[PDB]
A paper describes a structure:
The second cryo-EM structure of substrate-bound Pex1/Pex6_WB shows a dynamic state where both the D1 and D2 rings of Pex1/Pex6 have an asymmetric configuration. One of the Pex6(D1)/Pex1(D1) dimers thereby swings out. This results in an open central D1 channel with a diameter of 20 Å, approximately 5 Å larger than the symmetric D1 ring in the “single-seam” state. Interestingly, the outward Pex6(D1)/Pex1(D1) dimer is stacked on top of a compact characteristic pair of dislocated seam domains of the D2 ring Pex6(D2)(E)/Pex1(D2)(F). We therefore term this conformation as the “twin-seam” state of the complex. In the “twin-seam” state, only four alternating Pex6(D2) and Pex1(D2) domains (Pex6(A), Pex1(B), Pex6(C), Pex1(D)) form the substrate-interacting spiral staircase of pore loops 1. The “twin-seam” dimer Pex6(E)/Pex1(F) is dislocated from the central channel. The lowermost D2 domain of the staircase is thus bound to ADP and the “twin-seam” dimer is released from the staircase. Intriguingly, our analysis suggests that the nucleotide binding pocket (E) between the two “seam” domains remains bound to ATP. Intriguingly, the pore loops 1 of the “twin-seam” in the D2 ring are close together and almost at identical heights, which, at least to our knowledge, has not been observed for canonical ATPases bound to substrate.
The double-ring AAA+ ATPase Pex1/Pex6 is required for peroxisomal receptor recycling and is essential for peroxisome formation. Pex1 and Pex6 are both composed of two N-terminal domains (N1 and N2) followed by two AAA cassettes, known as the D1 and D2 domains. Pex1/Pex6 is the only known double-ring heterohexamer of the type II AAA+ family, with both subunits capped by a unique pair of N-terminal domains. We used a Pex6 Walker B mutant (E832Q) and “trapped” the heterohexamer processing an endogenous substrate along the central channel formed by the active D2 ring.
Residue numbers in the entry:
A (entry chain D): 510 to 818
B (entry chain C): 1 to 1030
C (entry chain B): 716 to 1021
D (entry chain E): 556 to 634
Write the structure that this text describes.
């Protein structure tokens, strides 16, 4: 590879699924033959790095290398430690406007289903929120098949026949078998009272309704709300409904889960759930029962309350 | 464009001239003062950035001939005038006027001018004395304008441009130090005589290797192409006539042995290399070790003395790449090419260098030669990178004899014959670079003044050499090891090898064709090791064997052992021991030089029989200076790049700034930073090229993005080790902490800087403890430390340490705290110590784990004997009474500094302005008015709350204004619109700064209240009044 | 073994096996324990902190056993306990809920049957009253040397010892001691509460000496004569002194080597300490009131029948 | 499935079988028009999504209920 690329002049090498040819062996825990020693994978890698480096110092134009892989950290860190990398384009997701044009292309891909009655896909995005391009391929084909028998006539997509597919087909390729149940209260389903919903909304939507305004002012993004909770009522509804803004990645926690009497109860719970909050795109997170979680120990009591606090 | 060149008698300030013909091929009557551009041919890696020149039209100049003043470049017309150059017409004469220019002038004339109180009199003096006229004149950053007198000290930021006093400040500087007596441009002074300068029968001068390549197109005379090739010599002055035979003559004189004929030229007039010298390519000096004063005389001869030597019996030197199957073919083919493509004289007792690109390697090329014409390839593609010596060896002379120096090989009457090998020792680098002549991959030049470990290893090899040149064979060997990765282990051995003129093998162990594979082939691997090594030693000069990554093959016992694991281990130890010790008798004076990565991991037997030990550290700041000085050098950027536009630094670059800000980084990181800077600058260059534009002549590196790249270097370090990154908090993003900043600089800056005069006493202040009410910046100080100084920022977030199992401490606190010793100089940050280290006397039930943490933390922290590795531990607490006697003033953490409610009068203003950094306000509501309108007992971060909710209501005002404007829009156009299309079709830029005018402050003052009340303050003021027990 | 080995041809009693130090302050004798190595030429091996303990129940005693194996292998060494309080508190019904057996392993091997290791047990601890009669016994570890604050002239003595500041046979007063050595005022105008306090005081006064030296040095030249005032009848823009840095960074380019100096206080560019610079910090010398610990000491000193 | 418990060599055997199966599954759709494929699995989780994506449908077959059982006994007891 090196020699050919050197002779064919200005060239780019593509390597795909790098883990097989240059991935670390699963970063295994415990170090038998792994503490001061290397697996053969790295022994390939270093040879490649040296040879191409002694090319690269001859002509900055001659050769470049493109790695495609799963996740920047997961590849062999030797690839970082010699300063081989210099970039990190991550194809984070599809997004609202493009996904419609994409979906139209799939619809017109092959075995032409000739579009649909009335709609133009924009609303039809509604359930596809978390999906991915291969997912929209599969879903398109599924819609076509489960049209083509439920009518004896062919090409007409109908709102209801489309909708009934997403109720169960659940492509959800990154989601395992099943990871949802709660679907009760919509954002526009104002059970109870709007009395201060004004301020909740004002905190909620403005970073997604006036978006660049926040950028030009160096505020730290104002947030953080405590509900007054005096009747022992409300938030269970209100927070779930606010989560059904759907422009968010909600995650569930409840106070009286965490008070394990083992000494370490704060670690492996609170830090675990907030690393989870980092693993999701940033989102609301629920807490309750602060009368349990946060008594004002005041340097008087100093109890295990403080080790979680 | 090509152009012919001539040097005028020089006014310096007088213009150049543009020829009528170039004023027709690029004629423009609107711009008769055509500003030309010229490229000056020179010795050097490439043509230095060309000069814009102001010119007058001349019709008398012959075709493409052009004239420039001589002394404008310090050369005199007594020196050989160069006959050609290259020219560029400036597109539309587009040139910028300079933003600033500075001049240096002698104190006498300086004062004589400064005696004039009316500045315009000096401006006219610029005309009367120097004939300067604005817009006509172009000026250049550093040029001496008259010897002993006026000089330009800088142009900035541009190196060249137009001037007008209506914008150019014309800064003047006084030469109090009289250095203008030395800073004279005149490259020649008239010698007292030409006779009596030695004798024409015999001159003696130091030879030197020419610091650069030179080529047939630059030389003044016109040698042939096929003959006359390769071998040339260069001379400096009227020395060219002291030999009686001019430039273009042959001479042959040598200090010893056979004569060696060479063609001698005068140096080109634009030369930087020191005179009183005779310069040569490496080809000549390779035959003449030491003896730098060379015998010289007329020594002429009537053309070639021998026309044929009917056979030649050449031999290759031994050496690392000269004995491998994969090179053999390319070696022979390049040999054939080289000897076929030209005719040359050769002689016994002489060496021929051959150079080729080792990248060509396992590409054969099937048809280019022997069945094909003589001129075959553009080496522009068939590059070079590596170099070899062939000894000319015996040749079959005819009846003629003794004058062997003229032997020559007709391509049909003669053939070349291999004799397998010969032994000879390469030049000492101290007298001559090979690499810088051939432009190969570089080998950084140490100097033994400031690299202790180099002084060590060089002395070891020097003695191993010279002691066995004398009667005493030395079995010297050494192992190199390091605590970090990536320190230049191999680079040292290589440098030393060149600096001493010592041969080496270069071998890496990782590339061995098998692993520590389970089925035993340790035989196969150690066999291949020795079998690859041995081949050159039968004809090796004094040499070393260098082994890279011994740690890969000298695994060590006990993790979980198979029986074969034992057998492999012991077999390897044994066979390596034998191999090395055998070599010590197989050949004398031949030194094993290993390298390893974890000295704990080398097996005990090898660790005992090994000789010397050297620990090479991460470099000091004093060393960093020279590191940047290398990789930011001209040659060290110019090598890498194709386009003819060269690159440089701006001479503004503060080497102090780099060396301090790059602290803790390794040399490989310094390369990364500099090359990134080069990239960013070139991106700026091509962004500039989008318009007709300015500064096209050359991109330079500049201090801003070179500073910036440090941040990326530090983050790419952090993602390797210590993943957390930190948001920027610059020093001015905090204020109103004057005493505290005082003590913090008295602790982290002044004792850390200036150890040339700070004694660096035998113990040091370990840390900083901040205590007081929340919201007084005691978190923020740490993010600021992480931002502004070069310090890394490891931390644990409160009870990040405690963990489920018993024996908590080794699961975290030990590993992290020692990791801070393992890291380069770095803080540890703590918060909520009153939660982490309960006072041990308040004994706890339920396993008492607080006693375990506190004991291990004190043990790892304090005492710090032999351990002042910059491990500053700094942190914050709410209420210090709950701290352990860990705080007892041993100085282990006890640098108590308070923070509290500000002084009433203006420190709240300093707060508001600091938090107003990068905020915006643009009216007569001065911050004094806000700071007076706010009542007291509001404190610290509550004023950030006051700005926060003022900002919130300001953006609310803007949001409702937008709601109005979008409603009034939708009522009139875009009847079915909401968001994306709206924002993408509005184009606001006056509004988008969204500045609050006022009123949001007043309703913030209405809505906000102090977050801690005085009844809450009293609970802190009590512990404040404890003064921690005083 | 280095002075009495011609006497100890065969002492018919086994030689005394160890020493536990204690102090009511932070144990300044930790420094002593670190120092006696080089002061005596023996090797040193240290139980820093609690590090014997482990997660795994099978590991604790294997760890301490391998520790004593190492010690008995390195025949001439000092075996040090960095904080005996960490691991040897009073026996009970699993007052350490698990792995407390380590204290029994210690009690078994502190002398056991082998008696004289040739190694000796060394330890330090503040609050040793948490240790128990089950472990301190003359047939076991016992010697119980008390440390106390350096009253009166011992303040002077320790001050003189630190300010002598002699090391590396070079710069032999590395702290530039006050020329008169007028310590007899300073040492008792200071109330001394430890030694590390006195050391910190002196170090900070050295820092202040550097401050007065470093801040005076340039201005002391500037006052009799300014420099680099490159006036040029400046106009249009008030760069008159803002230019100074961009000037200096180019206007100076000298280089020098093997530089020497002599007017400094007996070391290169160093600033002498002075009695006023210490005396001003007599109020900066901060106590940490805990004298009830002496009543905590009054327990073992009542166990002392003397 | 693929798990930490097994040799990556064997796991690459699984990979090879998965991939070639998926390809042959489509290859019938190339070589042999109108082919249709029925799969059966006793526990749905064990087939990785790498294959499950190439469904067109799936059916949960439950255990029968009362009306079905009444039909099924009639079958077995018919003459
Ligand atoms: N002081 C230095 N001057 C110039 N180049 C240096 C320096 N230190 C390191 N380098 C560069 O870094 C590399 C050094 O390679 P070397 O074999 O010495 O070490 P390494 O490969 O980083 O480490 P190791 O062998 O421990 O894995 C070369 O590319 C060299 O150009
Ligand atoms: N110059 C300044 N002086 C005081 N406060 C400032 C300054 N600049 C910013 N702040 C504010 O102070 C905050 C940090 O205050 P501080 O660290 O004392 O409190 P905290 O982090 O909320 O609490 P804790 O100290 O208990 O962790 C910053 O987030 C910012 O809002
Ligand atoms: N008599 C003494 N009492 C207290 N400290 C002293 C005494 N003599 C010297 N020191 C100081 O002891 C410091 C070294 O730390 P050392 O371990 O000896 O004590 P410590 O930190 O108070 O003890 P501990 O390790 O028990 O916490 C030095 O800075 C030294 O000045
Ligand atoms: N609109 C509403 N008004 C009043 N109560 C409601 C409403 N919707 C649900 N609830 C009741 O409130 C409770 C839901 O939890 P929540 O109100 O948050 O109580 P808690 O504070 O104890 O969680 C249930 O009893 C539910 O039936
Ligand atoms: Mg290396
Ligand atoms: Mg804080
Ligand atoms: Mg101590």
């Amino acid at each position: 590879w090196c020699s050919f690329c050197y002779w064919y002049g200005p060239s780019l090498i593509v390597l795909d699924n790098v883990e097989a040819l240059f991935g670390k062996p699963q970063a295994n825990d415990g170090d038998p033959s792994n503490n001061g020693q290397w697996d053969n994978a790295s022994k390939l890698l270093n040879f490649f790095i040296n040879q191409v480096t002694k090319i690269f110092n001859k002509d900055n134009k001659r050769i470049r290398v493109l790695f495609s892989g799963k996740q920047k950290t997961q590849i062999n860190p030797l690839l970082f430690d010699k300063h081989f990398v210099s970039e990190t384009w991550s194809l984070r997701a599809p997004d609202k406007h493009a996904r419609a044009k994409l979906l139209e292309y799939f619809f017109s891909k092959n075995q032409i289903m000739k579009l649909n009655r009335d709609l133009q896909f924009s609303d039809l995005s509604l359930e596809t929120e978390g999906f991915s391009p291969l997912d929209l391929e599969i879903f398109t084909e599924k819609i076509f098949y489960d049209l083509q028998l439920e009518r004896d006539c062919d090409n007409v997509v109908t709102r209801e026949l489309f909708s009934k597919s997403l109720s169960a087909f659940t492509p959800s390729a990154l989601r395992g078998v099943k990871l949802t149940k709660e679907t009760n209260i919509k954002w526009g389903d104002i059970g109870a009272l709007a009395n201060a919903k004004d301020v909740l909304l004002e905190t909620l939507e403005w970073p997604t309704k006036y978006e660049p305004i926040f950028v030009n002012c160096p505020l730290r993004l104002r947030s953080g709300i405590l509900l007054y909770g005096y009747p022992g009522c409300g938030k269970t509804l209100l927070a779930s409904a606010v989560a059904q803004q759907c422009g968010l990645n909600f995650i569930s926690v409840k106070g009286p889960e965490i008070l394990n009497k083992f000494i370490g109860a704060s670690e492996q719970n609170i830090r675990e759930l907030f690393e989870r909050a980092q693993s999701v795109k940033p989102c609301i997170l629920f807490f309750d029962e602060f009368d349990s979680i946060a008594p004002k120990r005041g340097h008087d009591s100093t109890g295990v309350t403080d080790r979680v606090v | 464009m090509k152009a012919s060149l001539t040097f005028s008698l020089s006014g310096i300030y007088a213009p150049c001239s543009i020829s009528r013909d170039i004023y027709l091929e690029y004629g423009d009557k609107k711009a008769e003062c055509l500003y030309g551009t010229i490229r000056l041919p020179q010795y050097g890696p490439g043509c230095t950035p060309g000069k814009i020149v102001h010119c007058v039209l001349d019709d008398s100049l012959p075709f493409c001939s052009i004239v420039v003043p001589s002394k404008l470049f310090g050369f005199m017309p007594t020196q050989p005038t160069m006959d050609f150059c290259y020219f560029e017409p400036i597109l539309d004469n587009v040139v910028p006027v300079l933003d600033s220019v500075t001049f240096l002038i002698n104190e006498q004339l300086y004062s004589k001018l400064m005696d004039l109180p009316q500045e315009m009199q000096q401006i006219q003096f610029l005309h009367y004395k120097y004939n300067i006229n604005s817009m006509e004149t172009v000026v250049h950053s550093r040029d001496i304008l008259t010897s002993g007198l006026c000089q330009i000290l800088n142009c900035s930021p541009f190196p060249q441009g137009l001037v007008d006093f209506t914008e150019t400040q014309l800064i003047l500087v006084n030469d109090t130090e009289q250095k203008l007596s030395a800073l004279k441009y005149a490259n020649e002074d008239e010698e007292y005589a030409l006779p009596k300068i030695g004798t024409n029968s015999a001159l003696s001068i130091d030879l030197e290797s020419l610091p650069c390549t030179i080529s047939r197109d630059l030389l003044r005379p016109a040698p042939h192409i096929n003959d006359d090739n390769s071998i040339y010599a260069f001379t400096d002055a009227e020395t060219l006539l002291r030999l009686d035979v001019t430039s273009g003559s042959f001479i042959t004189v040598s200090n010893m042995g056979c004569v060696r004929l060479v063609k001698l030229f005068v140096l080109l007039l634009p030369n930087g290399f020191k005179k009183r010298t005779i310069y040569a390519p490496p080809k000549i000096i390779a035959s003449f070790p030491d003896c730098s004063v060379v015998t010289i005389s007329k020594s002429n001869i009537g053309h070639t003395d021998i026309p044929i030597a009917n056979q030649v019996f050449i031999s290759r030197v031994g050496g690392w790449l000269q004995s491998q199957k994969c090179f053999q073919n390319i070696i022979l083919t390049t040999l054939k090419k080289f000897f076929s493509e030209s005719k040359r004289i050769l002689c016994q007792n002489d060496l021929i260098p051959i150079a080729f690109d080792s990248s060509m390697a396992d590409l054969n090329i099937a048809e280019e030669n022997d069945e094909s014409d003589d001129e075959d390839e553009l080496g522009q593609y068939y590059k070079n990178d590596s170099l070899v010596w062939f000894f000319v060896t015996s040749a079959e002379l005819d009846c003629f004899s003794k004058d062997n120096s003229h032997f020559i090989i007709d391509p049909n009457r003669t053939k070349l014959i291999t004799t397998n090998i010969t032994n000879r020792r390469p030049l000492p680098l101290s007298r001559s670079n090979l690499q810088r002549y051939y432009g190969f991959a570089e080998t950084f030049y140490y100097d033994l003044h400031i690299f202790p470990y180099v002084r060590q290893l060089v002395n070891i090899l020097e003695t191993s050499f010279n002691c066995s040149q004398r009667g005493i064979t030395l079995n010297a060997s050494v192992l190199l090891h390091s605590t970090t990765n990536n320190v230049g282990k191999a680079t040292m051995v290589r440098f030393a090898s060149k600096y001493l003129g010592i041969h080496l093998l270069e071998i890496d162990c990782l590339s061995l064709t098998s692993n520590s594979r389970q089925l035993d082939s340790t035989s196969k691997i150690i066999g291949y090791i020795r079998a690859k090594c041995e081949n050159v030693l039968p004809y090796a000069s004094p040499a070393v064997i260098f082994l890279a990554h011994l740690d890969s093959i000298l695994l060590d016992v006990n993790a979980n052992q198979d029986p074969e694991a034992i057998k492999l281990q012991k077999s390897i130890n044994f066979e390596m021991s034998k191999l090395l010790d055998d070599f010590t008798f197989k050949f004398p004076g031949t030194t094993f030089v290993g390298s390893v990565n974890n000295i704990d991991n080398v097996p005990s037997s090898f660790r005992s029989h090994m000789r010397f030990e050297i620990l090479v550290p991460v470099p000091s700041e004093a060393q960093r200076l020279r590191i940047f000085q290398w990789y930011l050098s001209s040659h060290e950027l110019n090598r890498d790049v194709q386009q003819k536009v060269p690159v440089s630094y701006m001479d503004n670059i503060s080497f102090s700034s780099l060396s301090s800000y790059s602290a803790g980084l390794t040399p490989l990181d310094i390369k990364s930073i500099v090359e990134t800077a080069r990239m960013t600058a070139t991106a700026r260059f091509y962004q500039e090229s989008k318009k007709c534009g300015w500064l096209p002549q050359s991109i330079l590196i500049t201090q801003e993005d070179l500073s910036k790249a440090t941040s990326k270097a530090r983050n790419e370090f952090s993602v390797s080790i210590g993943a957390p990154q930190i948001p920027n908090v610059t020093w001015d993003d905090i204020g109103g902490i004057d005493f505290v900043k005082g003590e913090i600089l008295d602790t982290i800056d002044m004792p850390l800087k200036h150890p040339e005069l700070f004694t660096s006493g035998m113990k040091k202040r370990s840390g900083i403890l901040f205590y007081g009410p929340p919201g007084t910046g005691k978190t923020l100080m740490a993010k600021a430390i992480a931002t502004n100084f070069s310090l890394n920022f490891f931390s644990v977030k409160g009870p990040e340490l405690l963990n489920m199992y018993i024996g908590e401490s080794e699961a975290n606190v030990r590993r992290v705290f020692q990791k801070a010793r393992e890291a380069k100089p770095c803080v540890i940050f703590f918060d909520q110590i009153d939660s982490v280290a309960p006072k041990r006397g308040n004994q706890g039930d339920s396993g008492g784990v607080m006693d375990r943490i506190v004991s291990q933390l004190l043990a790892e922290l304090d005492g710090m004997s032999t351990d002042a590795d910059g491990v500053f531990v700094i942190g914050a607490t709410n209420r210090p009474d709950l701290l352990d006697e860990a705080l007892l003033r041993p100085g282990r953490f006890d640098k108590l500094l308070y923070l509290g409610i500000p002084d009433t009068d203006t420190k709240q203003l300093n707060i508001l302005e600091a938090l107003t950094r990068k905020f915006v306000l643009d009216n007569d509501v001065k911050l004094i008015e806000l700071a007076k309108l706010c009542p007291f007992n509001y404190t610290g971060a509550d004023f950030y709350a006051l700005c926060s909710d003022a900002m919130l209501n300001a953006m609310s005002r803007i949001a409702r204004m937008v709601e109005k404007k979008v409603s009034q829009h939708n009522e009139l156009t875009g009847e079915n619109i909401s968001t994306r299309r709206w924002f993408d079709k509005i184009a606001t830029k006056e509004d988008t700064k969204v500045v609050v005018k006022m009123e949001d402050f007043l309703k913030a003052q209405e809505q906000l209240t102090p977050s801690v009340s005085r009844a809450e303050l009293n609970h802190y003021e009590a512990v404040r009044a404890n003064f921690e027990g005083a | 073994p280095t002075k009495y080995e011609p006497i100890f041809v065969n002492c018919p009693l086994r030689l005394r096996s160890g020493i536990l130090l204690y102090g009511y302050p932070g144990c300044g004798k930790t420094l002593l324990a670190s120092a006696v190595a080089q002061q005596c030429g023996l090797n040193f091996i240290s139980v820093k902190g609690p590090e014997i303990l482990n997660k795994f129940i099978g590991a604790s005693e294997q760890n301490i056993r391998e520790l004593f194996e190492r010690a008995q292998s390195v025949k001439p060494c000092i075996l040090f306990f960095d904080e005996f309080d960490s691991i040897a508190p009073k026996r009970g019904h699993d007052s350490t809920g698990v792995t407390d057996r380590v204290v029994n392993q210690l009690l078994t091997q502190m002398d056991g049957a082998e008696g004289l290791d040739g190694v000796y047990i060394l330890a330090a601890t503040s609050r040793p009253d948490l240790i128990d009669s089950a472990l301190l016994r003359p047939g076991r570890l016992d010697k119980s040397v008390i440390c106390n604050i350096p009253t009166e002239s011992e303040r002077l003595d320790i001050l003189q010892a630190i300010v002598n500041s002699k090391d590396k046979d070079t710069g032999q007063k590395k702290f530039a001691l006050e020329k008169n050595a007028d310590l007899k005022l300073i040492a008792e105008k200071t109330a001394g509460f430890s030694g590390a306090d006195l050391q910190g005081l002196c170090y900070n006064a050295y820092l202040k000496s550097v401050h007065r030296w470093l801040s005076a040095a340039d201005q002391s030249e500037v006052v009799p004569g300014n420099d680099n005032i490159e006036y040029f009848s400046i106009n249009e823009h008030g760069r008159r002194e803002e230019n100074r840095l961009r000037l200096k960074t180019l206007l100076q380019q000298d280089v020098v080597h093997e530089t020497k100096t002599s007017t400094s206080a007996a070391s290169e560019l160093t600033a002498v300490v002075t009695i006023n610079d210490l005396l001003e910090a007599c109020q900066e010398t901060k106590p940490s009131i805990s004298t009830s610990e002496l009543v905590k000491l009054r327990g073992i000193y009542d166990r002392f029948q003397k």
